[PDB]
Write a protein that binds this ligand. Structure first.
Ligand SMILES: Cc1ncc(COP(=O)(O)O)c(C=O)c1O
Lengths: 446, 440
């Protein structure tokens, strides 16, 4: 098709999109289709002549929609929020026109990482605006980022021990290397240790599911005693399981003095640190060698955006593609800092709403302190009761919740995710959960 | 911003984008601004209140455009891998709104069938209810080559162990050999290193095609030296020139010698939707796997690389975009698209044959012309250097044998023979100046 025809149809698709979004509340979030429903609906071969746009869009409604998961539904309460903003869509559009994989890309990235750095109020050591030795950079995921960090640290320690002891071979050194994370850390850490070919050990967390000084130091002594070599440690701010926070201020100086590279994975919670109410949870970065979080989670930049800063950017070269700063730029300019702060606080509020609806009911309990946007709750009593509860919910198909385990407790996770969630939805949700609970607790007397 | 702001600014962006594409002829293909230009044009910190859309798009022209490459220019005469058609942009827009997905798994299966029939692969390769064999979208062609090689590795190991229970996997692998043309895309070499097997190049003939004589030789030399051939990559539309391995001669030898025959159609594979070109693909019946990237010529986004196997046992929502592109051009549209480009190629080819200073190195079949200035390597390097220096068009070189070469690829959506005329005349001029200098 020619330019002029894209105009008619692009604008049409813009309308089609807006509609889908405006009416999204109406859709059953999860698909109920029987395998192989699709093939009969689509012809055996490609068409010789072009089809009409009318026919194709109809077909998107009739054929594709029924078979897709609508995660932008405000009724999606699983995992963590996944960024989808209209400003990013507009960027993707432009970005599709230009194409990408020169200087505007690299430069807007550096400057955007500086914008974001100033927002999270990071130590100047991570910022390269005033000529600093460190800087920011966009990765595809927290996981990739953690890997990039593990491998920079690996390279580092090798270059150190070899400088001080030339006779020493790479193979012989990596045999000894040990890395760390909290027992609450994310799989991406294990992934990294295996790719990086080193040993990974978990530190036991405390009753707030946080890594502390004493526990980390036990570990280190234990492994140094056996001749192993600490080189890398990941600290999680906003664990996947229950949004708990490693004690960065306790752990930072330890890592420093033990010549252990400290990476802070803040993939979800990191977004909230642009609000002064939450910035303190980040106190400690001072000590970190690298810091990462996912704007494509809670900062409205559409997927593929992961933000990482390092104290020494040449440390990073040791590890040896797209135009993502454009999205960031659009999102930041189209919302402003204030608007972003509001986005965050609106979720946090709604999470506290749900929280206090649960407390208020003598039958339930909160399991972890509710810090920001995730609620870990439970029906008082047996696990089995709560596995029963989650079944009912997940079977009813109105909402969907993801259980986790906290030591020995089975726990239900409610997560404020979507861009358009209001107080109304959260309430509707809690109704549904509470009907189903009473049902369960009544089938408990039989 | 809310949904009705987006109905407005979204349609506005549709306009900005179309304008962009339409006037693209006029833009210089390469930035003429230095790393460092951007920071001072843009404030030091993010704004507190929302900026206006109007000020943002103005900033895109004034600030972003000078700093950007413009690979969608007709004057970009190489393969732009992240190039996209309009139907693809329409798809992306929807894909954004949407974002465990039964529709995306199943559409992909049907699209692979569509592509399949378009290329008219033998019935075997079809996943269309036949049972045996089938097709899959791999990440990239490198990833495909590696998948075939692993499948092939596994096959030979089982084969040899059934015959000789004593042989160990390790003892076997140490002796395995893989082959490909000496024009084999780099991604064969990588697949071998990861598969931990020996890779040897088969020398091509006067046409840069792999032939029986050369294949048999290597199988003889290596079998006798106690090695075991197990895998080969035949290339259809090489990445240096636009060469074509002879499947008719190579195929039968593979089947006989138990060599697994993977065909790498690369970029060229798309041309086989046209009857004129299907003869270059005769031989696939012998092949065990077949791969190509439809991005190049079937106007998709390159997240896509199609691969089929004769036997399936031996082994992001992409499908939507495919569906949109195929549904929106039609087969005939797609065909006209390849055909136009081939035509532009033969037109550039003429201009080249019509100047005695230049030669043509490889038969021009598809959208690529390999030519140079008659004479010396030195000379040509100098000509390429000053073409890129002028930044008005872009070309990439390659080495065929021992000889530097200029590749002219007609690849963009908007290319017309005017752009070709204008580019050739540009290439003549700087060749004059280059020739002069050489005399000194
Ligand atoms: C002949 C050939 N094989 C393999 C490849 C690799 O393609 P991809 O980058 O999609 O893996 C290319 C593309 O550049 C090619 O031209």
């Amino acid at each position: 098709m020619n330019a002029s025809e894209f105009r008619r149809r692009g604008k049409e698709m813009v309308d089609y999109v807006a509609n889908y979004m405006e009416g999204i509340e109406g859709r059953q979030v999860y698909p109920d289709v029987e395998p192989g429903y699709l093939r009969p609906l689509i012809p055996a071969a490609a068409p010789q002549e072009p089809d009409t746009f009318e026919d194709i869009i109809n077909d998107v409604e009739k054929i594709i929609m029924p078979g897709v998961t609508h995660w932008h539904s405000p009724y999606f309460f699983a995992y963590f929020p996944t960024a989808s903003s209209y400003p990013a869509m507009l960027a993707d559009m432009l970005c599709g026109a230009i194409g990408c994989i020169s200087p505007a890309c690299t430069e807007l990235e550096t400057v955007m990482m500086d914008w974001l750095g100033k927002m999270l109020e990071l130590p100047k050591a991570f910022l390269n605006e005033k000529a600093g030795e460190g800087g920011g950079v966009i990765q595809g995921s927290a996981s990739e980022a953690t890997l990039v960090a593990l491998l920079a640290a690996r390279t580092k320690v090798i270059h150190r021990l070899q400088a001080a002891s030339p006779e020493l071979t790479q193979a012989a050194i990596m045999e000894k290397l040990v890395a760390y994370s909290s027992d609450q850390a994310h799989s991406s850490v294990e992934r990294a240790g295996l790719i990086g070919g080193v040993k990974l050990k978990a530190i036991p967390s405390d009753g707030n599911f946080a890594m502390r000084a004493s526990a980390l130091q036990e570990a280190l002594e234990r492994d140094k005693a056996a001749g192993l070599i600490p080189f890398f440690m990941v600290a999680t701010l906003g664990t996947t399981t229950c949004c708990s926070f490693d004690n960065l201020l306790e752990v930072g100086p330890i890592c420093n003095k033990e010549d252990i590279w400290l990476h802070v994975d803040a993939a979800y919670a990191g977004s909230a640190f642009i609000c002064p109410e939450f910035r303190h949870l980040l106190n400690g970065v001072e000590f970190a060698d690298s810091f990462n979080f996912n704007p494509h989670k809670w900062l409205l930049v559409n997927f593929d955006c992961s933000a990482m800063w390092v104290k020494k950017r040449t440390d990073l070269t040791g590890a040896f593609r797209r135009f993502r700063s454009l999205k960031m730029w659009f999102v930041f300019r189209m919302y402003g800092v204030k608007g972003l702060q509001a986005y965050i606080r609106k979720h946090v509020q709604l999470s506290h709403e749900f929280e206090s609806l649960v407390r208020q009911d003598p039958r339930f309990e909160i399991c972890v302190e509710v810090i920001l946007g995730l609620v870990c709750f439970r029906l008082k009593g047996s696990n089995k009761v709560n596995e029963a509860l989650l079944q009912r919910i997940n079977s009813a198909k109105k909402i969907h919740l993801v259980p986790c385990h906290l030591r020995d407790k089975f726990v239900l996770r409610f997560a404020i995710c979507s861009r358009t969630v209001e107080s109304a939805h959260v309430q509707r949700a809690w109704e549904h959960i509470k009907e189903l609970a009473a049902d369960v607790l009544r089938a408990e007397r039989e």
